[PDB]
Design an enzyme around this catalytic site. Structure first.
Site, short mmCIF file in Angstrom:
data_model
loop_
_atom_site.label_atom_id
_atom_site.label_comp_id
_atom_site.label_asym_id
_atom_site.label_seq_id
_atom_site.Cartn_x
_atom_site.Cartn_y
_atom_site.Cartn_z
N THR A 93 24.04 54.12 2.24
CA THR A 93 24.06 53.72 0.83
C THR A 93 24.96 54.69 0.00
O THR A 93 24.99 54.45 -1.18
CB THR A 93 22.65 53.63 0.27
OG1 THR A 93 22.14 54.98 0.16
CG2 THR A 93 21.73 52.69 1.06
N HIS A 114 24.41 65.47 -4.38
CA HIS A 114 24.08 64.00 -4.48
C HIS A 114 22.58 63.84 -4.43
O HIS A 114 22.05 62.93 -5.13
CB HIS A 114 24.77 63.12 -3.40
CG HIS A 114 26.25 63.39 -3.30
ND1 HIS A 114 27.09 63.08 -4.33
CD2 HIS A 114 27.01 63.95 -2.31
CE1 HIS A 114 28.36 63.41 -3.99
NE2 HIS A 114 28.34 63.97 -2.79
N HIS A 124 16.14 59.18 -3.18
CA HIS A 124 16.89 58.70 -4.34
C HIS A 124 15.89 58.50 -5.43
O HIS A 124 14.77 57.99 -5.15
CB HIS A 124 17.64 57.37 -4.03
CG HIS A 124 18.53 57.51 -2.82
ND1 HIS A 124 19.89 57.69 -2.94
CD2 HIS A 124 18.26 57.51 -1.46
CE1 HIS A 124 20.44 57.76 -1.72
NE2 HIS A 124 19.39 57.70 -0.79
N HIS A 168 15.91 62.62 2.80
CA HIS A 168 16.21 62.81 1.43
C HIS A 168 15.68 61.75 0.56
O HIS A 168 15.07 60.81 1.15
CB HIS A 168 17.75 62.88 1.20
CG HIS A 168 18.40 61.58 1.63
ND1 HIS A 168 18.77 61.35 2.90
CD2 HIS A 168 18.61 60.50 0.89
CE1 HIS A 168 19.24 60.04 2.93
NE2 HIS A 168 19.13 59.51 1.72
N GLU A 206 16.52 52.34 -4.16
CA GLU A 206 17.78 51.60 -3.78
C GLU A 206 17.50 50.17 -3.36
O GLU A 206 17.91 49.23 -3.97
CB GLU A 206 18.49 52.41 -2.67
CG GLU A 206 18.79 53.85 -3.14
CD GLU A 206 19.97 54.35 -2.44
OE1 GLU A 206 19.99 54.52 -1.23
OE2 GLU A 206 21.04 54.61 -3.09
N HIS A 213 14.31 58.34 2.46
CA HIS A 213 15.05 57.91 3.63
C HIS A 213 14.91 58.94 4.72
O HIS A 213 15.39 60.12 4.51
CB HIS A 213 16.54 57.78 3.23
CG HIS A 213 16.75 56.59 2.38
ND1 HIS A 213 17.93 56.42 1.59
CD2 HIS A 213 15.97 55.48 2.20
CE1 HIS A 213 17.85 55.26 0.96
NE2 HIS A 213 16.63 54.65 1.31
C1 LIG Z 1 28.16 65.08 6.69
C2 LIG Z 1 26.83 65.30 7.34
C3 LIG Z 1 26.63 66.40 8.20
C4 LIG Z 1 25.38 66.59 8.81
O1 LIG Z 1 25.14 67.53 9.55
N1 LIG Z 1 24.38 65.70 8.53
C5 LIG Z 1 24.58 64.65 7.70
S1 LIG Z 1 23.15 63.64 7.48
C6 LIG Z 1 23.94 62.31 6.49
C7 LIG Z 1 22.96 61.29 6.02
O2 LIG Z 1 21.80 61.42 6.45
C8 LIG Z 1 23.30 60.18 5.11
C9 LIG Z 1 24.65 60.02 4.64
C10 LIG Z 1 24.89 59.02 3.74
C11 LIG Z 1 23.94 58.04 3.38
C12 LIG Z 1 22.61 58.18 3.86
S2 LIG Z 1 21.42 56.90 3.48
N2 LIG Z 1 21.24 56.94 1.89
O3 LIG Z 1 20.12 57.15 4.12
O4 LIG Z 1 22.02 55.58 3.88
C13 LIG Z 1 22.34 59.22 4.73
N3 LIG Z 1 25.80 64.43 7.11
ZN LIG Z 2 19.50 57.61 1.23
#
Ligand SMILES: Cc1cc(=O)[nH]c(SCC(=O)c2cccc(S(N)(=O)=O)c2)n1
Ligand SMILES: [Zn+2]
EC number: 4.2.1.1
Length: 257
Positions: free
Chosen positions: A195, A61, A93, A91, A103, A116
Site C-alpha cells: 500500500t 512514513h 496506519h 507497522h 487502509e 499490518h
Molecule cells: C526497504 C525495506 C528493508 C527491510 O529490511 N524491510 C522492509 S519491510 C517493508 C514493508 O514491510 C512494507 C513496505 C511497503 C508497504 C507495506 S504494506 N503497507 O504492509 O503493504 C509494507 N523494507
Molecule cells: Zn501497511
C-alpha cells in the site's frame, strides 16, 4: 519524496510508480455482502511463540517493529497460503481523528487504524527477492477501533517518545505479537499490493474480520509521532493511509459464513 501530504500524497504516486494504476492495487473496500465464502479455505496458522523482535524504527512514513527473520521463528501458513511465510515486521496506519485511519474499509466503514504484520515467502530466501514475485508476501491486516485499551499494545506505545522523528530507532526485544491479535482468526483474502511505494503487486492480503480495541490514549500517542527528521519543522505523523483502490478484476474470499 512520496509521502502523505497535499503535494506528494497518494494521488501523486503514479507519476513515480506507474503500477499505482495497476490491476491488483491495495487497499480495497471489502463489500461483506459480495465476499465469496470459500469452504475450502483452511484456518489461518499463526505461529508466533518463538518470535524475536529486535528493534522499533520511525522510517518517516510509519513505525516498524522488526523481527529476526533469519530462521522460521514467527511464521504464517495455512489459510489461503501454500507454504510458509516469515514475519519480518509490523507497522500501523492511522488517522488524525478516530473516524479514519484504516487502509482497507468494510462496507465503506473506516477504522481508526490498521495493523499490518508483514511476512515473506521462504521459498524466495529474503524479503527483497520475495517482493519481486506475485506470491512473495502475506500481509495480515487487523483493524483497530477505539474503545477499551489493548494491554499487549502498551509496550509499543510507551517506546514511541524515543523514536519521535524520521530515522530514529530503539532496541525493542521480547515483544510478543500474539498480544495484538483478536480472539477470532476468521478472515477475508484477495491478491493485491504493497500500500506504499513501490506499490509492488506481490501481496496475498489476509484481513481479519474482528477488530481489536485500543484506547483513545493509545492512538493519541501514535499521533504525536513526526514525519520529519529531528531539527526540521514539525509535521505530525497522521493520516498515513492510502484510500481504497478499484477492485478491478478481483473477488474477495471469506473464510466464514
Ligand atoms: C526497504 C525495506 C528493508 C527491510 O529490511 N524491510 C522492509 S519491510 C517493508 C514493508 O514491510 C512494507 C513496505 C511497503 C508497504 C507495506 S504494506 N503497507 O504492509 O503493504 C509494507 N523494507
Ligand atoms: Zn501497511
Amino acid at each position: 519524496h512520496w509521502g502523505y501530504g497535499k503535494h506528494n500524497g497518494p494521488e501523486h504516486w503514479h507519476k513515480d510508480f506507474p503500477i499505482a494504476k495497476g490491476e491488483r492495487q491495495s487497499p480495497v473496500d471489502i463489500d461483506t455482502h459480495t465476499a465469496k465464502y470459500d469452504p475450502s479455505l483452511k484456518p489461518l496458522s499463526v505461529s508466533y511463540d518463538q518470535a524475536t523482535s529486535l528493534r522499533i524504527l520511525n522510517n518517516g512514513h510509519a513505525f516498524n517493529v522488526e523481527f529476526d527473520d533469519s530462521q522460521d521463528k514467527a511464521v504464517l501458513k495455512g489459510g489461503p497460503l501454500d507454504g510458509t511465510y516469515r514475519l519480518i515486521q509490523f507497522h500501523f496506519h492511522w488517522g488524525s481523528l478516530d473516524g479514519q485511519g484504516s487502509e482497507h474499509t468494510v462496507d465503506k466503514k473506516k477504522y481508526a487504524a490498521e495493523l499490518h504484520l508483514v511476512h515473506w515467502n521462504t521459498k524466495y530466501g529474503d524479503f527483497g527477492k520475495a517482493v519481486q514475485q506475485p506470491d512473495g508476501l502475506a500481509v495480515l491486516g487487523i483493524f483497530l477501533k477505539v474503545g477499551s485499551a489493548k494491554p499487549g499494545l502498551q509496550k509499543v506505545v510507551d517506546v514511541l517518545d524515543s523514536i519521535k522523528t524520521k530515522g530514529k530507532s530503539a532496541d525493542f526485544t521480547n515483544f510478543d505479537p500474539r498480544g495484538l491479535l483478536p480472539e477470532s482468526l476468521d478472515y477475508w483474502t484477495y491478491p493485491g499490493s504493497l500500500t506504499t511505494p513501490p506499490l509492488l503487486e506481490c501481496v496475498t492480503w489476509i484481513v481479519l474480520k474482528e477488530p481489536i480495541s485500543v484506547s483513545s490514549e493509545q492512538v493519541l500517542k501514535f499521533r504525536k509521532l513526526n514525519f520529519n527528521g529531528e531539527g526540521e519543522p514539525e509535521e505530525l505523523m497522521v493520516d498515513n493511509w492510502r484510500p481504497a483502490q478499484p477492485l478491478k478484476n478481483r473477488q474477495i474470499k471469506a473464510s466464514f459464513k
